Amino acid sequence: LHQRAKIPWRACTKYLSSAGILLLSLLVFSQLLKHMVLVAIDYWLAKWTDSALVLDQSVYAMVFTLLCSLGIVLCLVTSVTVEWTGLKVAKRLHRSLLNRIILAPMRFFETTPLGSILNRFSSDCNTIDQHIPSTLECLSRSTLLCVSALTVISYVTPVFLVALLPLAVVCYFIQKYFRVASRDLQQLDDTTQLPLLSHFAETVEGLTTIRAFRYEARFQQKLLEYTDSNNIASLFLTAANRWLEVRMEYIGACVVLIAAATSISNSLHRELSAGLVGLGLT
């Protein structure tokens, strides 16, 4: 149970260390700088609109254009960097796995099943080659966007941190419980998908024998049981997903209510500009 609920920190560390110091450093720097540039773009929009409210407008337009162009360039840089990192890690990892499997003693091949060795090269290599780069990019971008957004709405309203702490605790508990439940449900969903397809194959290649024994009804009932197991696994997985999403959207509703109320109070009679509350609201 302790190993089940444990995030594979060592595996992620080895995966990122196979990329090299230069490429990983460039990836981290590009991601952080790009999200800072996006924050700068929206903050400059707030200052621009405040200046137009009080009303160097061409200077404002030129700085906004420069910031947006820098953001587009850095988006290209971070996309190319994360895909390059995935390619390099995939190549090095497959080469190392092939060489180490080759150097293994014959006792290892005699005792261990062929499926365990080959499933790495088939499924785990495919996952590392294709799915992990995009998932790593999505996780990095979403985490940095959430952190930058919380930082912005805490910058416009410093009193938001007081309400941010209990919301952070509640969100942490929600995501922990969802992660353990969702891991179990996803694994169960795949393991329920497998025997249904195997049953379809077995029935097709042995149809004459099945119909000669008059075992059509029994095999149909077996199929009904298999697909009911797959359906209930899928339904529990999507119910857990909707549970998490409802909780997160309600947390976001509380966040926008607190940020709105505090920013309106600070903007009415505490000398906060309208652009900053609009920034925090978005």
Partner 1 sequence: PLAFCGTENHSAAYRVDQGVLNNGCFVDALNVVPHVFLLFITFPILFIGWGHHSTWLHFPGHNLRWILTFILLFVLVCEIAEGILSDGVTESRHLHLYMPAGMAFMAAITSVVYYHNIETSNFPKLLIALLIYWTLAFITKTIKFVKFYDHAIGFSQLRFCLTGLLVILYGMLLLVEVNVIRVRRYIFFKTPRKVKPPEDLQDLGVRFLQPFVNLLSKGTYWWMNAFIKTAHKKPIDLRAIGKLPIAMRALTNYQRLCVAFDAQARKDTQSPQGARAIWRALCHAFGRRLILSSTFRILADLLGFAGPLCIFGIVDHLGKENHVFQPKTQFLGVYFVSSQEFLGNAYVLAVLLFLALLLQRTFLQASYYVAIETGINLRGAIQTKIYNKIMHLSTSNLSMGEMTAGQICNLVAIDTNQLMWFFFLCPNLWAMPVQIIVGVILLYYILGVSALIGAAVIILLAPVQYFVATKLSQAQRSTLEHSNERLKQTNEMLRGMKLLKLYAWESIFCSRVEVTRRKEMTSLRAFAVYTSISIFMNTAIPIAAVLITFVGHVSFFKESDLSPSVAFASLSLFHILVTPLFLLSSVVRSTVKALVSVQKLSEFLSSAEIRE
Ligand X SMILES: COc1ccc(Cl)cc1C(=O)NCCc1ccc(S(=O)(=O)NC(=O)NC2CCCCC2)cc1
Annotated binding site for ADP: 107, 110
CB nearer ligand X, residue 83 or residue 245: 245
Closest CA to 266 of 221, 114, 3, 275: 275
89 touches, from ligand X, partner 1, none (C-beta below 5 to 8 Å by class)? none
260 touches, from partner 1, ligand X, none (C-beta below 5 to 8 Å by class)? partner 1
Q: How many Å apart are CA 70 and CA 34, to the nearest integer? A: 8
23 touches, from ligand X, partner 1, none (C-beta below 5 to 8 Å by class)? none
Q: How many Å apart are CA 151 and CA 165, to the nearest integer? A: 13
3-state helix, strand, coil split of the chain in percent (to 5) is 90, 0, 10
CB nearer ligand X, residue 36 or residue 244: 244
Contacting ligand X (CB under 6 A), which of 135, 175, 220, 238?
A: 238
User: Residue 98 is encoded by which pair of tokens?
Assistant: 């092939």
Instruction: Kindly state the helix (H) or strand (E) to which residue 260 belongs, with its residue range.
Output: helix 216-269
Q: Specify whether the CB–CB gap between 34 and 79 falls below 8 A.
A: no
Tell me how long the chain is. Answer: 282
Stretch binding ligand X (CB under 6 A), from 41-49, 144-152, 204-212, 231-239:
231-239
155 touches, from ligand X, partner 1, none (C-beta below 5 to 8 Å by class)? none
Annotated binding site: 107, 110
Find the binding residues for ligand X in span 177-206 (CB under 6 A).
Answer: 189
| Contacts with ligand X, residue ranges (CB under 6 A) | 189, 234, 237-238, 241
